[PDB]
Ligand binder design. Structure first.
Ligand SMILES: COc1cccc2[nH]c(C(=O)N[C@@H](CC(C)C)C(=O)N[C@@H](C[C@@H]3CCNC3=O)C(=O)COP(=O)(O)O)cc12
Ligand SMILES: COc1cccc2[nH]c(C(=O)N[C@@H](CC(C)C)C(=O)N[C@@H](C[C@@H]3CCNC3=O)C(=O)COP(=O)(O)O)cc12
Lengths: 299, 298
């Protein structure tokens, strides 16, 4: 069991660089539209509190340099959707995959393709925290890098990178430019809310352990969803949703362990601790594997 | 600071499916040659003690089914290099990157493109352990998946997957077909030698933790290289060479913590444990980041 990203080639073929003045960021070239963070239009001093609608009115199509590698793509239109700039270019990307734009929920994981000046640098898997932060790895010049999932050659884009909080975590938008969480694209220290443990992913990990024959923590009690949720919040664990119960279904069926029985097993772990014992080799409960992640690495 | 693999697009364009009989696995298509593990020619019976050269001479070009996506490539030749079968096809792969075949040293890292039926499934980073296994994530059908590094648009292939040991770790060959370690491509339960921890990599990772504003493990003390290595070897850590010390230079210069200062930190963490704390989110001392790995990301 390890953190595994999706193959990045279908997204690599869509990465370009977008420059305004001296500001260069990454953009996403799908069909004949390039998506990138709107603050590329900002000067260093417009950034503390920018008037983006005002800033954009001064810009023209020919103020935008879009480059696939060193090849220029002529910009023939521009609009602002929330915090993302949409640049219509004169060439449909021949490497455009089947795609959708999706807004993910806390807990869901995705692969990040870290890029600089339109050139891929690395790929790794992140989880969206309950406080709408990701624990990423980004340097200057990374903005506009995207996060994604691939389901049957269809690339679901879910994240575009904008910001590093003072705590070192990262924040950004979906591909419609709506931030995850309560952050804004300004040059300003913002703090995320207190983070919690992703309960649905911890349960998936317990299912993963059972599948591999590590099952001492199973007990003979059960619980209601509401009773579990109330206890979970006293341990800094996220409450479960009906959708969380549903995506645990496959693992529940595969192991024969009811979701609410596994919750009662987790509940006992929270009230009593590990007592010097390990699960899948570890003394800590892992919370960045989704049920889908567990199914993927077991099937 | 997280484990990050190279982007895999240049390799994805090389993965094909290879079928001989009722065995299917992955192959790597570069120019007009397809590389895959040789046991794709074996039947259930042969697997116990296969005389491979004997079994190969009895195969024809038309016994090999190579599929690239949905298109089928026609084998026009075949040979064996150690545990790797080389299948010549009549079509050159347009997506062939600039590439080299390299054999990595233990402690060095690479990216693994896990593939099933010639279709890429996931990418992650591994390190060649000192006992020549890797701690990967591979299921049935993953044989022929490859490991690689990328330096200035040149892909260096170093690993082709063959086996999962009873202990759950993994083993394979370089692209010349030579196994890493004492393993053999027969269907037997094989054990590796005792593993040790990659010391130079643990130090790099401690330097990585400092760079990211975590310092709770440092201390005022210092140690000599030999006195460090005595303690390190007692804990089944690999010895630290003067080359390792130099390789860590950049990280030492950036953080202003001398190497042998960090060694004293590691020596204390080994003698005192981690006392319930975590470093970069880990309860355990992590050894799968090389110095260059840290630098490239930091
Ligand atoms: C407001 O005072 C602060 C105080 C304390 C902490 C703070 N953090 C930020 C911030 O994050 N600012 C955004 C730009 C704003 C307009 C949203 C930014 O810097 N994003 C980077 C990615 C970053 C760079 C390093 N690691 C990353 O993740 C880009 O890539 C685009 O900027 P570049 O032109 O490429 O450098 C401001 C700030
Ligand atoms: C009694 O014998 C044993 C006892 C105890 C442990 C054992 N382990 C193996 C082994 O690993 N055997 C190789 C083939 C031999 C001939 C080298 C194999 O099974 N390789 C997999 C990838 C593997 C499969 C699961 N996870 C992976 O990483 C392929 O991909 C090709 O096989 P498939 O055609 O896909 O089934 C044999 C064995």
């Amino acid at each position: 069991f390890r953190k595994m990203a999706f193959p990045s080639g279908k997204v690599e073929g869509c990465m370009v660089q977008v420059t305004c003045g001296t500001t260069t960021l990454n953009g996403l070239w799908l069909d004949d539209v390039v998506y990138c963070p709107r603050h590329v239009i900002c000067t260093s001093e417009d950034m503390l509190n920018p008037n983006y609608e005002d800033l954009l009115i001064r810009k023209s199509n020919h103020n935008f340099l879009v480059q696939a590698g060193n090849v220029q793509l002529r910009v023939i239109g521009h609009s602002m959707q929330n915090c993302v700039l949409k640049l219509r270019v004169d060439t449909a990307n021949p490497k455009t995959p089947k795609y959708k734009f999706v807004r993910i929920q806390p807990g869901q994981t995705f692969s990040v393709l870290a890029c600089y000046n339109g050139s891929p640098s690395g790929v790794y898997q992140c989880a969206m925290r309950p406080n709408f932060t990701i624990k990423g790895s980004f340097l200057n010049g990374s903005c506009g890098s995207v996060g994604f999932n691939i389901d049957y050659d269809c690339v679901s884009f879910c994240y575009m990178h904008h910001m590093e909080l003072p705590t070192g975590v990262h924040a950004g938008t979906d591909l419609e430019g709506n931030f995850y969480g309560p952050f804004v694209d300004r040059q300003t220290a913002q703090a995320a809310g207190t983070d919690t443990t992703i309960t649905v992913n911890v349960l998936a990990w317990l299912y993963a352990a059972v599948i591999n024959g590590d099952r001492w923590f199973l007990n003979r009690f059960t619980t209601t969803l509401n009773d579990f949720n109330l206890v979970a919040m006293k341990y800094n664990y996220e409450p479960l949703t009906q959708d969380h119960v549903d995506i645990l279904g496959p693992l529940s069926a595969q192991t024969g362990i009811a979701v609410l029985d596994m919750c009662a097993s987790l509940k006992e772990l929270l009230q009593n601790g590990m007592n010097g014992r390990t699960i899948l080799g570890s003394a800590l409960l892992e919370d960045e594997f989704t049920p889908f992640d567990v199914v993927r690495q077991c099937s």
